[PDB]
Amino acid sequence: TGRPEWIWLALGTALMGLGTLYFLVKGMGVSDPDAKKFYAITTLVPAIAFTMYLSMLLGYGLTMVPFGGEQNPIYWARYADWLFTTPLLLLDLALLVDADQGTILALVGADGIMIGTGLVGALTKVYSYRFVWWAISTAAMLYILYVLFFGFTSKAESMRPEVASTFKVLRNVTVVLWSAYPVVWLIGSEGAGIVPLNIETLLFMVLDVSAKVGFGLILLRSRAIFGE
Amino acid sequence: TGRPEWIWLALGTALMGLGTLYFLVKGMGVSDPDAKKFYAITTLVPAIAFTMYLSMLLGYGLTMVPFGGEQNPIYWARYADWLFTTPLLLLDLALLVDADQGTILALVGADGIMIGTGLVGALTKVYSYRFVWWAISTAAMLYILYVLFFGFTSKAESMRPEVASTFKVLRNVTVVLWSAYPVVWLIGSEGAGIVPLNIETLLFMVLDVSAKVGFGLILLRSRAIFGE
Amino acid sequence: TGRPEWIWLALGTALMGLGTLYFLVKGMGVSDPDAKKFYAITTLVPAIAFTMYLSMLLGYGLTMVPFGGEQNPIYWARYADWLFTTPLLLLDLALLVDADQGTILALVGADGIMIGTGLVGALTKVYSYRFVWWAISTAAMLYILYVLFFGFTSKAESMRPEVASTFKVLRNVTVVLWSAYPVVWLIGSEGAGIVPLNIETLLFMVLDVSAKVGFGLILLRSRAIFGE
Numbered sequence: 001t002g003r004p005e006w007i008w009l010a011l012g013t014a015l016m017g018l019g020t021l022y023f024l025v026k027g028m029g030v031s032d033p034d035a036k037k038f039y040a041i042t043t044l045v046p047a048i049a050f051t052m053y054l055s056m057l058l059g060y061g062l063t064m065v066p067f068g069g070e071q072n073p074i075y076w077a078r079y080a081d082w083l084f085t086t087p088l089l090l091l092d093l094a095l096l097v098d099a100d101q102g103t104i105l106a107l108v109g110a111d112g113i114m115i116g117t118g119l120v121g122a123l124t125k126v127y128s129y130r131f132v133w134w135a136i137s138t139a140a141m142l143y144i145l146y147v148l149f150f151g152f153t154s155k156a157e158s159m160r161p162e163v164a165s166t167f168k169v170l171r172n173v174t175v176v177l178w179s180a181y182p183v184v185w186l187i188g189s190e191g192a193g194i195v196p197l198n199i200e201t202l203l204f205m206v207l208d209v210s211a212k213v214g215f216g217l218i219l220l221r222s223r224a225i226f227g228e
Numbered sequence: 229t230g231r232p233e234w235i236w237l238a239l240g241t242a243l244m245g246l247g248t249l250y251f252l253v254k255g256m257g258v259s260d261p262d263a264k265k266f267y268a269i270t271t272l273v274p275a276i277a278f279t280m281y282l283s284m285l286l287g288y289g290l291t292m293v294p295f296g297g298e299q300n301p302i303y304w305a306r307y308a309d310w311l312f313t314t315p316l317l318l319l320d321l322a323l324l325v326d327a328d329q330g331t332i333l334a335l336v337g338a339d340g341i342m343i344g345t346g347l348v349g350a351l352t353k354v355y356s357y358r359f360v361w362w363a364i365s366t367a368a369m370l371y372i373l374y375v376l377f378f379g380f381t382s383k384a385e386s387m388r389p390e391v392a393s394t395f396k397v398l399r400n401v402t403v404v405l406w407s408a409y410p411v412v413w414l415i416g417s418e419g420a421g422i423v424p425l426n427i428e429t430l431l432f433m434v435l436d437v438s439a440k441v442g443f444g445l446i447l448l449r450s451r452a453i454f455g456e
Numbered sequence: 457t458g459r460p461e462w463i464w465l466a467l468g469t470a471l472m473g474l475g476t477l478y479f480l481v482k483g484m485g486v487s488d489p490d491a492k493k494f495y496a497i498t499t500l501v502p503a504i505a506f507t508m509y510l511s512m513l514l515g516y517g518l519t520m521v522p523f524g525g526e527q528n529p530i531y532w533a534r535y536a537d538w539l540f541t542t543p544l545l546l547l548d549l550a551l552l553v554d555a556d557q558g559t560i561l562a563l564v565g566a567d568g569i570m571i572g573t574g575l576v577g578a579l580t581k582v583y584s585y586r587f588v589w590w591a592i593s594t595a596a597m598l599y600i601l602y603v604l605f606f607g608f609t610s611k612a613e614s615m616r617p618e619v620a621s622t623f624k625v626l627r628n629v630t631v632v633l634w635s636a637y638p639v640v641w642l643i644g645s646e647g648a649g650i651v652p653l654n655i656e657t658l659l660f661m662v663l664d665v666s667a668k669v670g671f672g673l674i675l676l677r678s679r680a681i682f683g684e
């Protein structure tokens with residue numbers, strides 16, 4: 001519970017905060033309208049995560065959930081974070097390939113379902129039911145990955161070269177990191193409990209920083225964000 | 229409470245899920261940009277309701293509220309559903325007639341107030357106060373219906389013929405079904421308690437499926453969704 | 457707690473309700489597309505506050521939070537209000553100067569952090585931690601004010617004259633009123649408790665009505681809202 005994993009929470013807080021400041025300073029030197037959208041979106045991601053990681057570190061974003069026959073510590077603050085940061089990350093990818101509003105809404109909607117059902121599962125009191133919510137959230141995740149490959153990948157190409165390769169790299173990064181979350185949830189304290197909360201927190205911290213700060217570094221350092 | 233009405237909840241879950249899959253498959257054959265927006269919006273509606281109906285069926289979206297001198301079972305998951313699905317349904321209607329952003333914001337805002345105040349009323353502990361919230365939510369609903377008739381109906385016409393007639397039918401469907409919700413709430417467990425929760429659940433299930441799946445069928449089967 | 461301050465809550469409810477109705481009637485005489493956006497945004501602000509002030513008056517939006525060694529009455533309904541009304545007010549300012557989407561997202565995001573962290577601080581059980589959240593929220597507020605002066609003020613000018621002067625006055629009004637909120641929070645029941653809840657409620661009521669109704673009056677009475 002709220003002790004062993006404090007170091008990963010403090011490290012996560014520090015890393016999200018440092019990334020936010022870096023992106024903020026880096027973006028000061030920005031005039032291009034479109035480059036500005038990418039900077040605004042990308043800087044807000046770590047900023048939000050920073051606040052939620054801090055809430056977990058201080059103990060606010062933690063709650064106890066009874067199930068399986070025990071009082072299980074559940075960090076609900078993660079979902080509040082993801083509810084806002086995941087769609088923003090998807091927005092960066094969509095803006096990059098200039099997706100139509102229809103596909104953007106589909107991605108944002110699918111993302112809301114993924115995080116929402118993930119939260120319902122995290123707080124469910126009936127053990128077996130938790131995995132039903134996990135499956136539904138996982139289906140929503142696969143839909144998103146499908147759109148990113150069969151509804152996006154085919155358009156980045158019909159666009160500028162630099163946009164295509166940058167999108168391809170960010171797309172690959174997203175697919176790899178995002179797919180790891182359901183696995184961590186399944187084996188950790190929220191699911192089967194095969195991995196202790198301490199290790200679970202460490203895993204999510206590494207994934208989060210990479211999916212947010214790592215992702216932002218790649219994106220904000222490319223020329224694909226400027227109007228040619 | 230959480231037993232007799234299980235069948236309507238299970239039927240609702242199954243019907244929302246089947247509708248979502250149908251719209252998903254049907255939309256695979258879709259290239260037109262605008263047709264895509266209508267499919268994305270319309271498919272997300274049943275998808276969300278599906279998750280909330282399931283949460284109620286499993287018991288997660290149910291809570292007890294003390295008032296009138298009793299512990300009353302209240303399915304709060306309904307509001308979480310409506311908070312997202314009603315504005316999306318309004319968006320389908322607005323896109324159909326190509327409404328201006330000003331009117332869209334007014335409808336979305338009025339809708340948020342309607343659902344939000346409806347939720348406050350559902351959880352209020354002072355019996356008489358529950359109806360004050362019901363009245364305010366009902367006023368917000370009338371505003372929406374007013375805009376749909378005196379701010380929308382007059383524009384669908386100044387547009388394409390097929391757009392006008394389809395909008396007219398969906399407009400009529402909406403007015404009829406939506407107006408029934410406040411009545412059901414008033415006579416059911418949330419309000420006067422003249423109708424038992426069992427029958428109340430049945431009523432909302434029929435209304436929901438019709439307002440979502442029924443509505444989607446009419447819309448997604450018309451040529452009004454394509455750019456001529 | 458829920459008694460002495462009832463008059464300020466009732467006065468606030470009445471004033472927000474009267475403002476909403478006034479803006480609603482005033483806006484009936486509106487055809488211009490852009491003028492419509494300003495009316496829709498501006499009327500929704502008092503409408504939302506009206507509902508939240510009423511929830512506080514009736515006792516629904518009030519909760520007890522343990523900290524410092526006492527059971528402290530906290531009106532959480534304020535944050536639900538601000539979560540929606542502050543970004544809408546920022547939207548009025550942004551539309552006025554025709555800001556780019558990038559800056560709009562930055563303002564909305566910064567605003568969400570400001571209100572969200574303010575709420576976390578309001579509900580935090582560890583006294584000293586409450587001020588950590590206050591500081592973070594205050595930093596987010598300063599960012600918003602910075603953008604309004606160094607990212608907005610310089611564009612209203614490169615626009616129409618009437619737009620510039622109206623924006624300047626609304627900008628000034630916002631800076632003055634918004635800066636007062638963190639001060640009131642710090643000295644009131646949410647923070648140091650130097651000022652009693654009764655006086656705290658009075659202060660927020662005066663600020664809210666001015667920042668919403670006062671603000672709306674200035675904006676909706678100017679010609680800057682019309683397309684020349």
Ligand SMILES: *C/C=C(C)/C=C/C=C(C)/C=C/C1=C(C)CCCC1(C)C
Pocket residue numbers: 049082085086089114115118119134135137138141178179181182185208211212
């Ligand atoms: C900054 C945070 C990021 C990029 C988070 C991504 C999170 C996910 C892809 C989470 C997915 C989940 C499932 C697919 C099912 C089980 C529950 C979740 C929410 C952990």
Ligand SMILES: *C/C=C(C)/C=C/C=C(C)/C=C/C1=C(C)CCCC1(C)C
Pocket residue numbers: 277310313314317342343346347362363365366369406407409410413436439440
């Ligand atoms: C998919 C769901 C739909 C179309 C739901 C519509 C719901 C309403 C129009 C609800 C209205 C209510 C009132 C007018 C006042 C009493 C409380 C509500 C929320 C039941």
Ligand SMILES: *C/C=C(C)/C=C/C=C(C)/C=C/C1=C(C)CCCC1(C)C
Pocket residue numbers: 505538541542545570571574575590591593594597634635637638641664667668
């Ligand atoms: C209609 C309401 C308005 C314009 C509200 C404005 C509120 C603020 C600028 C609140 C700011 C706060 C901080 C800067 C830190 C402490 C907590 C808050 C939320 C009171």
